[PDB]
Design an enzyme around this catalytic site. Sequence first.
Site, PDB file in Angstrom:
ATOM      1  N   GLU A 731       0.792  -1.225   0.000  1.00  0.00           N
ATOM      2  CA  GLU A 731       0.000   0.000   0.000  1.00  0.00           C
ATOM      3  C   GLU A 731       0.826   1.278   0.000  1.00  0.00           C
ATOM      4  O   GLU A 731       0.247   2.370  -0.040  1.00  0.00           O
ATOM      5  CB  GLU A 731      -0.954   0.017   1.202  1.00  0.00           C
ATOM      6  CG  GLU A 731      -1.963  -1.117   1.193  1.00  0.00           C
ATOM      7  CD  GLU A 731      -3.171  -0.834   2.061  1.00  0.00           C
ATOM      8  OE1 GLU A 731      -2.999  -0.259   3.157  1.00  0.00           O
ATOM      9  OE2 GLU A 731      -4.294  -1.190   1.645  1.00  0.00           O
ATOM     10  N   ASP A 740      -5.413   9.460  -3.263  1.00  0.00           N
ATOM     11  CA  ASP A 740      -5.413   8.073  -3.703  1.00  0.00           C
ATOM     12  C   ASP A 740      -6.030   7.983  -5.099  1.00  0.00           C
ATOM     13  O   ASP A 740      -6.316   8.993  -5.748  1.00  0.00           O
ATOM     14  CB  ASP A 740      -6.145   7.197  -2.689  1.00  0.00           C
ATOM     15  CG  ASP A 740      -7.575   7.642  -2.455  1.00  0.00           C
ATOM     16  OD1 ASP A 740      -7.950   8.734  -2.932  1.00  0.00           O
ATOM     17  OD2 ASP A 740      -8.327   6.894  -1.796  1.00  0.00           O
TER      18      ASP A 740
END
Length: 900
Positions: A731, A740
């Site tokens: 991640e 994101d």
Amino acid sequence: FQSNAMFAWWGRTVYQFRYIVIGVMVALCLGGGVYGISLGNHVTQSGFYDEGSQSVAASLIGDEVYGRDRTSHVVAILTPPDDKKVTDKAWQKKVTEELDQVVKDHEDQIVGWVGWLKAPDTTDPTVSAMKTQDLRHTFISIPLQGDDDDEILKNYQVVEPELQQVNGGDIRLAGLNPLASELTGTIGEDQKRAEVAAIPLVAVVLFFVFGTVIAAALPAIIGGLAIAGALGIMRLVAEFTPVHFFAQPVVTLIGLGIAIDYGLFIVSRFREEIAEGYDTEAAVRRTVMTSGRTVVFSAVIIVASSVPLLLFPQGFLKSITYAIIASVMLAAILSITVLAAALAILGPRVDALGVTTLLFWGRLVNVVMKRPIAFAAPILVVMVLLIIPLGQLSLGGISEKYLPPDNAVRQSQEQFDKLFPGFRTEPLTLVMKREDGEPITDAQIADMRAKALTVSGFTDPDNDPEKMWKERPANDSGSKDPSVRVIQNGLENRNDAAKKIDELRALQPPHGIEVFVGGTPALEQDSIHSLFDKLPLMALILIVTTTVLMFLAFGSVVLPIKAALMSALTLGSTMGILTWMFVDGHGSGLMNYTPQPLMAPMIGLIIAVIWGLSTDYEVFLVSRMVEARERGMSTAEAIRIGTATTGRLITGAALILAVVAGAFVFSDLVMMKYLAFGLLIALLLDATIIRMFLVPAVMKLLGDDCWWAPRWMKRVQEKEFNIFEMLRIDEGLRLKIYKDTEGYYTIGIGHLLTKSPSLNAAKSELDKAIGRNTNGVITKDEAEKLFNQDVDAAVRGILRNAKLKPVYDSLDAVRRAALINMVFQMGETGVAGFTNSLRMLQQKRWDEAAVNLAKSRWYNQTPNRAKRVITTFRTGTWDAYEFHLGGIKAFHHHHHHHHH
Ligand SMILES: CCCCCCCCCCCCOC[C@H]1O[C@H](O[C@H]2O[C@H](CO)[C@@H](O)[C@H](O)[C@H]2O)[C@H](O)[C@@H](O)[C@@H]1O
Ligand SMILES: CCCCCCCCCCCCOC[C@H]1O[C@H](O[C@H]2O[C@H](CO)[C@@H](O)[C@H](O)[C@H]2O)[C@H](O)[C@@H](O)[C@@H]1O
Ligand SMILES: CCCCCCCCCCCCOC[C@H]1O[C@H](O[C@H]2O[C@H](CO)[C@@H](O)[C@H](O)[C@H]2O)[C@H](O)[C@@H](O)[C@@H]1O
Ligand SMILES: CCCCCCCCCCCCOC[C@H]1O[C@H](O[C@H]2O[C@H](CO)[C@@H](O)[C@H](O)[C@H]2O)[C@H](O)[C@@H](O)[C@@H]1O
Ligand SMILES: CCCCCCCCCCCCOC[C@H]1O[C@H](O[C@H]2O[C@H](CO)[C@@H](O)[C@H](O)[C@H]2O)[C@H](O)[C@@H](O)[C@@H]1O
Ligand SMILES: CC1(C)CCC(NC(=O)c2cc3c(F)cc(F)cc3[nH]2)CC1
Ligand SMILES: NC(=O)CN(CC(=O)O)CC(=O)O
Ligand SMILES: NC(=O)CN(CC(=O)O)CC(=O)O
């Protein structure tokens, strides 16, 4: 202070460029074989003396001034046919014409032929002794052209096929060159015997270690490539320094066994890794990072045991050391390069062709656990009993007896020495060189003769003291410099040479004259003196270097000294059995050899080889139990873990080495039999009495004292890979607020801040979370804190869900981290949809669970992360993340974004 990033990088690269590696290395090895087949015509037979000694200098000065003695070159016993006498004139003329024809065919190789048969009508007493009293036998001398021993032997081999036919084949050829030809052809005989015997037996032993054609064939191909490349390397070395004949069989005796053992161990570890769930790439990388490191350490140990042989000046030992080093290091390279790439190419295909295609240690180590003294002292006493014959060992030079007693050439030489005694001599020589350069007067010669007649024990045939120490003969190959004069005389007892030499060198020379004591006895004794002078330093270097390498590999102080004493006892016992076998003559009748003193440099060779063997096996074994004590295992079962993990591989390797050594114990060269039998004795002592019995018992005697290391000679425990680094890989670790893939504000490791478009609202949330004014920037430790919060929230959510709690309680920390990864990615609701997959994992059916997980659309949409997590499930290790496909591009916030 170790280094494994090098081995990790190579395990990765040999899979990345496997075809180039296999092609280049196989081409190099095959070209080296093609280039080194011709080594048989470029080896030498010299190197048994100290070439910086006084006897060698005397020999060189005598060769320069008087010329080398070509009378002992070729001796030919001729016997007339049909009980005729050597006086038959017709037979005389026939044999003389035959000899003249033979000599004039090879004027480039033969100097001539000299006998009584050439001048029968003579009164010279020495010439008239070349015929027996019965007139049934007469011998001639055939000097050959040449300037070094090798060229002379080549000329003799050129002339022999025709010279052997003389006198209807009833001519017996003895002397120096026939014996040399036989003793050197023993090497090729042993090579062919090995080709015939060991190759199918090694194939069978391998096929019994691996129940598969390919997995057993790979180490054999590795050994063949290693032999070819090592022969090529020794051929290349032959261009710079003389390589001895005896260096060729070493390559086959030592190189082949270690190469095949390296291949066996590496293929076995690759099969272990493949059977543990890893794919071919990770299998190759781990096989390298473990077994290749062990193999490289093994090679370094063998090199450290061989190098001290370079202290001795005998080029024989130097070329042997060169051969050993080349073979061993090339075997290691091939094991972690051709074999690694071949496994990377094949894969699980290495088990395709089974047996049909061609057509317990823990219990026993626990038996020694109850009563260690019941096996320790009763074995130490037996070993120190086998050591006592080692004390009475003698040393000598090369004689006809190095051949078996039924060899035709040895029997011809012994019949010559029976029929014609007094011609074979070993005279000591006083060589006098005048430093100024003017001729030597007879007064100085007489002074030296008197000062030599001072010494006793020298032969006086006709009992005339002023006729002893006669002048050395002089032929045309000598300068006849009047500044150099050589006198010489034989010895009544040979065993006094080492004393008489030490006397002849204490004599005070005439004023302005330099004296050198030489001759065959002087050469041999000075060589032995150099050997004994340099032996203790060699032994000290050997022990110190091997003990330091064991300090490195063990991480202990008790174990290196213990293994040193073990290797010392093994070496002493093996050499005692060798003295009992070859000096005291036990086992000679079955093996057909003559008991005699051993070749002097063979003592250092056998010391080095046996010490290296013992140390290598002890290291490879004891490291496996140090592994268990590093894990935390108890002593009395760490020993069992190591011994039981090593059993089958150790026995197979010892079996292959024993096959190859027993293939050579049948040699017609007593030195070859000595070396091979010593190897067999040491190997069967280490594979059974040492490893099985004495090692576990003596180690348990010290209990928890064996692994005690002071300060920090021991390596540090690594940073244990955790869930933090795993989900950082999957991640990303961003220390500054970012957006994101969904356009929301994230920071740290996928920690969603807020779904608001305001950067200042996200900064408010982040400052409230961390507790300071972050300005959108956090440190790595604060990211770790946020990540731990999210992990704890996800875990609490899992224990709350009744569909995930059983499988989660079932798993281990690594697979639990994998499940938390799946949760963070796709929600508990999504994770619970893998009902049968989670059932498989809960039942510890890792293979089925992995295969079934790889069929979701989760794998279809996020294939790399899913493959990493599924590998973590299948194996239970962080290996899928400690060496992973680097570089993620799209960062996405995870579920259970914990706020507070
Ligand atoms: C594969 C293993 C098989 C072992 C094969 C052994 C075969 C036996 C052949 C023995 C030949 C001995 O020949 C005898 C020769 O002894 C010395 O020569 C020495 O002068 C050199 C100067 O350096 C010395 O260093 C050398 O030892 C030597 O050439 C004499 O000076 C020569 O007058 C004499 O002719
Ligand atoms: C492993 C080793 C085992 C083998 C060792 C065997 C050693 C072989 C030694 C055989 C010696 C053969 O020759 C011996 C004879 O020849 C030489 O004299 C003569 O030879 C000329 C020939 O033309 C004459 O014309 C001259 O009158 C005169 O110089 C030597 O000086 C003498 O000693 C002896 O009379
Ligand atoms: C071109 C010339 C360049 C110079 C020569 C070539 C480079 C030489 C590199 C240094 C030698 C590499 O080997 C040294 C080895 O010593 C130990 O070995 C142990 O590592 C295994 C890991 O599992 C254990 O199982 C075994 O107990 C035991 O073998 C250490 O762990 C490492 O330090 C390293 O592995
Ligand atoms: C052809 C295939 C060969 C196979 C290769 C592997 C074989 C390795 C053999 C090494 C063992 C050495 O053994 C040597 C011993 O054996 C025999 O003992 C003799 O004295 C004993 C008591 O009186 C009796 O047991 C014997 O009858 C009597 O022969 C020899 O005579 C002795 O010098 C020596 O004691
Ligand atoms: C418990 C299982 C242990 C494994 C068994 C060990 C193998 C024993 C069975 C095979 C032995 C057959 O040996 C065959 C040998 O024939 C020859 O012999 C000739 O040379 C030797 C010295 O002159 C002496 O053996 C003879 O006198 C002479 O005929 C050669 O040496 C080689 O062509 C070959 O090696
Ligand atoms: C699994 C293994 C790595 C264990 C040690 C094994 N080591 C040997 O088999 C060996 C042979 C050998 C020799 F001939 C001379 C010498 F000085 C030393 C020697 N070690 C290889 C395979
Ligand atoms: N592989 C899985 O995640 C379990 N699935 C897949 C399957 O049908 O095997 C079954 C289910 O969810 O009912
Ligand atoms: N390498 C990527 O960015 C894509 N994925 C990795 C994958 O495709 O499995 C990252 C993720 O989903 O966490």
